[PDB]
Paper text:
Adeno-associated viruses (AAVs) are non-enveloped ~25 nm viruses that encapsidate a 4.7-kb single-stranded DNA (ssDNA) genome. The AAV cap gene encodes for three capsid subunits, VP1–VP3 that assemble into a T = 1 icosahedral capsid at an approximate ratio of 1:1:10, respectively. VP1 contains a unique N-terminal domain (VP1u) that harbors a phospholipase A2 domain, which is believed to be responsible for endosomal escape. VP3, the major subunit of the capsid, establishes tissue tropism via cell receptor recognition and antigenic response by the host.
We found that AAVv66 contains 13 amino acid residues that differ from AAV2: one within the VP1u region (K39Q), one within the VP2 domain (V151A), and eleven within VP3 (R447K, T450A, Q457M, S492A, E499D, F533Y, G546D, E548G, R585S, R588T, and A593T). We obtained 52,874 particle images, which yielded a cryo-EM map at 2.5 Å resolution, and obtained a structural model with optimal real-space fit and stereochemical parameters. Overall, the AAVv66 structure is similar to AAV2 (root-mean-square deviation of atomic coordinates = 0.456 Å). Of note, VP1u and VP2 domains are each represented at approximately a twelvth of the VP3 domains for each particle, and similar to other AAV structures before, were not resolved in our symmetrized cryo-EM map. Therefore, only residues 219–736 are definitively resolved within the cryo-EM map, including 11 of 13 AAVv66-defining residues. Key differences occur at the interfaces between monomers of VP3 at the protrusions around the threefold axis. D499, whose mutation to the longer glutamate residue resulted in dramatic defects in vector genome packaging, forms electrostatic interactions and/or hydrogen bonding with S501. Here, the backbone atoms of D499 and S501 respectively interact with the side chains of the symmetry-related N449 and T448 amino acids, whereas the hydroxyl group of S501 hydrogen-bonds with the backbone carbonyl of the symmetry-related S446. Our observation of the strong effect of D499 mutation is therefore likely due to the disruption of the interface between VP3 monomers, leading to destabilization of the capsid. The polar hydroxyl group in AAVv66-Y533 (AAV2-F533) likely stabilizes the polar environment between the side chains of R487 and K532, and may contribute to the interaction with L583 of the symmetry-related monomer. AAV3b’s physical and functional interactions with HSPG rely on electrostatic interactions conferred by residues R447 and R594 (R447 and A593 in AAV2), but AAVv66 also lacks these arginine residues (K447 and T593). These differences from AAV2 and AAV3b suggest that AAVv66 associates differently with the canonical cell surface receptor commonly utilized by AAV clade B and C capsids, consistent with our findings that AAVv66 lacks heparin binding.
Residue numbers in the entry:
A (entry chain I), B (entry chain K): 217 to 735
C (entry chain H): 246 to 429
D (entry chain H): 614 to 735
E (entry chain F): 217 to 245
């Protein structure tokens, strides 16, 4: 599609369509793109005095990129409620992306007074990295996605990446990418850009909670035909003697029954309380944290493998670094109080996954004998074993959607730990840049590269449409289920609306696990 | 094929052909086969005074076997350089094997003077174990493969195997195999033997190194929208109070960012230095070694799961038993100095795999509270967790190629730990034997089995051709890459050549990971 | 991306060596108001990684054919009122382009001059000015020296919205020897 | 970073016409491409004058240029046994990576790179 | 060509032939 100056190159599409087992969400936003880095590539690195854990080396490019990797970019709160109250699972199917109504504007800063004017002949460059040749920076939970509220205008974030480093320096293996070394399409006002994408096959996300516990799967009315060791000594005349005795497990001793499965793996975290007085009076945010050690550096495990946030009757506690934490509206960046953030809770999976702040279990450490008593120890980290079952972390209305699976020789259960769908060929990155326009050149030749350009930026509309496949529930449960609902009581503001000043805000995080399912 | 005495039954084929995404390597050697065990099967077992860890029971057969399970049996150094400098991966596709120009010769040892003569009517027996019914002894890194230099003549190794043992004795379950109980083809001088084989589907070997680190995958320019616990106490009047505070991770605190993946598993090894003075003055080669315990026996873990050999700026260190160690030319068998061996290095995988001599990470062990401080401990062994990614051990020009996957109920990521391709149906074993020729018998009947034979051996040519599938690199990296190269400076000998005495030698081990790839 | 100024203030000018120059440095010629495009350096076409691929795996190479394109023209007028510069589009102005496909002008490429395309694709470069030398006798000219008016060629005029392309086929040349001899 | 071609001078005789600075000698090299801004006269006088114009509107131009070249390769067919010399990057650490930009955005080429690494018999 | 032990695999050719503007020389050692 291409036409003149006075022709819109696209329309505004924003709604959702529910049809059978599909739902199609399309959203449109308006964006603004500045000139980053003053048209330059720049090598960046960590500060000289930074600790060894915080060293890095990389580059920052003059390009921007579009990002729609959060659920609230596509679902309204009402649409999210429809989804989570009536379906056991869902997954993305295909995607459509469109960029249109481009406007480039030049700025003049004469005498502290700014004048903005159209530049009808300038252009912007766009290309999609459909072969995954650039370092993939999506899927790191960065800011700069499409806003949740359709009436908001957002700035396009700048592209940059990191490569191998040795302290603050680079090594011979580190690679540098010039994004101008890709074929890209140049658009003037009156051109548009589209492409399509098909998701690979992925398992449905489990939008349910189990109505049974992994350790409670037996018939409570019938005993087992297997025996377990129930007593190791028996009373003799005024004393005891070693004597093995066996029993069949029933309901009275349900903890001893033979079982076929084991709970999911574990990697223990430290426990903190939402009540301030319960926590220790010290700075253990890093010393008491759970981390992994890679190439001599320590890195915080956050949020880590999916484990239950707490056991029953203990909502006040949560793992130190084991849950997603969103910020309330207009909360700051650094060292905000607990009233400014929204802490998620993964308690629905405590039917199969162990609690994040307890041990996995206990194993024996010695060989008991006539003169040696049996000894056990706690297991604070347990890799996977044959016979384990577990659930993955839940997804949230304002959480990520997908993540690119790293191209490696091996990987196990490649669902991203922050939640979502792991894809070997995720939706490609979409890079965009204003073409530089040089200022008045000299009338005598000079071989030095240009350094004076016309100050300008661009704006336009972006739309993205995604088809999702649903998995309807088929429960024979008799009593009603738990549903997500709004409270009826009066209040100064309605949730998920704007306030008197025009600020849209999301008052709480919303998971997906409300319906139930048998184990 | 079959013809007379004065007809060659085959030609000499030895070269490589590069065509598109295939490379076909064919090699030919001349072999010599003695008479092993004096035509007998013999039960063998460990010495009576051996330690319990070294007990064994088995048999030695009068058969030999052909082995070409090392890369330098097929690739010249120049061909290996072509492969590793231009491809991201490779794998075997199909195989052709041929045995021809058999000559049997009888030896006479009259009066200390040896006379060798042709025996035109004697024969050799050959068969391929195409149904995997014999114990598979290939894939244990044994000597006796085809020589790397095509002009060398090699002796065929003897076949033998081990079965179940109880100390130095056997058990009822142990099995005994008579190789004469197989259909085999008998060849006189003038017959040849061929067969073909097709490799099953296996993943390409990763001939690249990652240009990104697993803990450095974010955009260093944009903060996350997630929060982490950054401070646990705050200053009060001349004191502190417990108070939780949260921050959004950026580049300044990059170690705290939320991430989607975890490094590969770990099994910690002891660290030793190539500088003699750095190591302890004691004998810790066995006491300080990492081992596994199976049926009451301890067995050294060598080389074990793939972990990085060292962190940056520490080339002098290497895990005690975590790397492949090749010997230099003409180095001895027992207790040679470090200058006689070539120690490999797996540093290219420290972007995803933990260092072999460090802990995997740290986990909390208790529950902090108003009067209890948080405590952590190191994790020295970590089984696989959902969300882990890792690389496999590299392959080398003089290392093994494949290994037979044991026929068991379960196995996880069945790539052999010494490196290479794991096959459920590997290339079959090829057994060969000289047919016994009895000496002058008595003229009166005797039921005792024969014990006097004509001393003889055999020789001939062997050829093997393998097709390999290549995976070409498609990088958009701007700066040049690292390549394997020869040094230009003058020297007394050229590498990978013969010396003044005719001895071919390989001066260093050569891996495959030179090109780079994004994570 | 390129930028083209107005050279010589739209004039042709006779140029010559200084009066006091040594005899070895005398010259006579002209400078034209035209610019010219130049891509006669290898790094205009090969990235360092591409150059490495070439030289590590091939014994020789040579060019075969060529495609050239000029597009997205923008003409801008400058106003220097009161030391303050204002730049604006001039939608109706044009640029002239032509290729000397019959080798009738003095060929100044192939003298290792600056002004080629930059090696890094993100750089913006200025188009160099065209000029040539002819026969001279000291600082003066002779009757044999020739003068070329470039407006005396058919050229294509482009407004913003027009583009210019052409194609070219290299003649047969021997491969460049990308090897070293292993014998003396 | 060296030249590619050079035009062979149109003369009666020449010997081995490969340009001495290196590259390919062509009798019909890629043609020159000339470009110029068309002059736009400024405000003229309202009474006729035969003198040529001397006042123009100050202006310049900008745009994009693209060039595509096809190259024919000659693959090596060596039977050499030992490995060859290849161009490679050094692995050791450094403040900047070669053939990249620095912290200020300046691209630089740290060394000249020839073509003669593979070997051939005489 | 291939045969047994008691078969010559070739003959002795050694002479020259002059015909017009050609000359064919064959030698055996």
């Amino acid at each position: 599609g291409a036409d003149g100056v006075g022709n819109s190159s696209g329309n505004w599409h924003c709604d959702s369509t529910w049809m059978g087992d599909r739902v199609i969400t399309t959203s449109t936003r308006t964006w603004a793109l500045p000139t980053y880095n003053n048209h330059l590539y720049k090598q960046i690195s960590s500060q000289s005095g930074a600790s060894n854990d915080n060293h890095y080396f990389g580059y920052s490019t003059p390009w921007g990129y579009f990002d729609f990797n959060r659920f609230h970019c596509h679902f309204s709160p009402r649409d999210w409620q429809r989804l989570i109250n009536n379906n056991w699972g869902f997954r993305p199917k295909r995607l459509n992306f469109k960029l249109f109504n481009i406007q480039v504007k030049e700025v003049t800063q004469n005498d502290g007074t700014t004048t903005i004017a159209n530049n009808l002949t300038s252009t912007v460059q766009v290309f999609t990295d459909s072969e995954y040749q650039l370092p993939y920076v999506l899927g790191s939970a960065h800011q700069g996605c499409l806003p949740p509220f359709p009436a908001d205008v957002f700035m396009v974030p700048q592209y940059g990446y990191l490569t191998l480093n040795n302290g603050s320096q680079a090594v011979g293996r580190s690679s540098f990418y010039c994004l101008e070394y890709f074929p890209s399409q140049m658009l003037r006002t009156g051109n548009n850009f589209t492409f399509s994408y098909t998701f690979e096959d992925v398992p449905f996300h489990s939008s349910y909670a189990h109505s049974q516990s992994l350790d409670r799967l037996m018939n409570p009315l019938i005993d087992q035909y297997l025996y377990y060791l129930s007593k190791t000594n028996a009373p003799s005349g005024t004393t005891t003697m070693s004597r093995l005795q066996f029993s069949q497990a029933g309901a009275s001793d349900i903890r001893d029954q033979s079982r076929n499965w084991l709970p999911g793996p574990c990697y223990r975290q430290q426990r903190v309380s939402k009540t301030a007085a319960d926590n220790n009076n010290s700075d253990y945010s890093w010393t008491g944290a759970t981390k992994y050690h890679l190439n001599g550096r320590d890195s915080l495990v956050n949020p880590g493998p999916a484990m239950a946030s707490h056991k029953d009757d203990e909502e006040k506690y949560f793992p130190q670094s084991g849950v997603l934490i969103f910020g309330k509206q207009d909360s700051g960046k650094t060292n905000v109080d607990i009233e400014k953030v929204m802490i998620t809770d993964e308690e629905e999976i405590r039917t199969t996954n162990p609690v994040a702040t307890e041990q996995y279990g206990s194993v024996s450490t010695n060989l008991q004998s006539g003169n040696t008593q049996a000894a056990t120890t706690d297991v604070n980290t347990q890799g996977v074993l044959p016979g384990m079952v577990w659930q993955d972390r839940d997804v949230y209305l304002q959480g990520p959607i997908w993540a690119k699976i790293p191209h490696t020789d091996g990987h196990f259960h490649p669902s991203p730990l922050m939640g979502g769908f792991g894809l070997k060929h995720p939706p490609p990155q979409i890079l965009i840049k204003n073409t530089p326009v040089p200022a008045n050149p000299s009338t005598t030749f000079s071989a030095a590269k240009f350094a004076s350009f016309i100050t300008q930026y661009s704006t336009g509309q972006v739309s993205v449409e995604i088809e999702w496949e649903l998995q309807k529930e088929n429960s024979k449960r008799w009593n009603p289920e738990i549903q997500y609902t709004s409270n009826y009581n009066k209040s100064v503001n309605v949730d998920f609306t704007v306030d008197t000043n025009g600020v849209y805000s999301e008052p709480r995080p919303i998971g997906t696990r409300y319906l139930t399912r048998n184990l």
